């Protein structure tokens, strides 16, 4: 989720994950990806 996402040192994003990061769960009620 969005404190998961972010505690982690993630960024919640609803495009593809950045090159160097990958997904790790999602945000926002599922819409959006993790991206760590």
Not at 9 to 36: D, E, H, V
């Amino acid at each position: 989720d969005h404190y998961a996402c972010v505690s982690s040192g993630g960024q919640c994003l609803y495009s593809a994950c950045p090159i160097f990061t990958k997904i790790q769960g999602t945000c926002y009620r599922g819409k959006a990806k993790c991206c760590k």
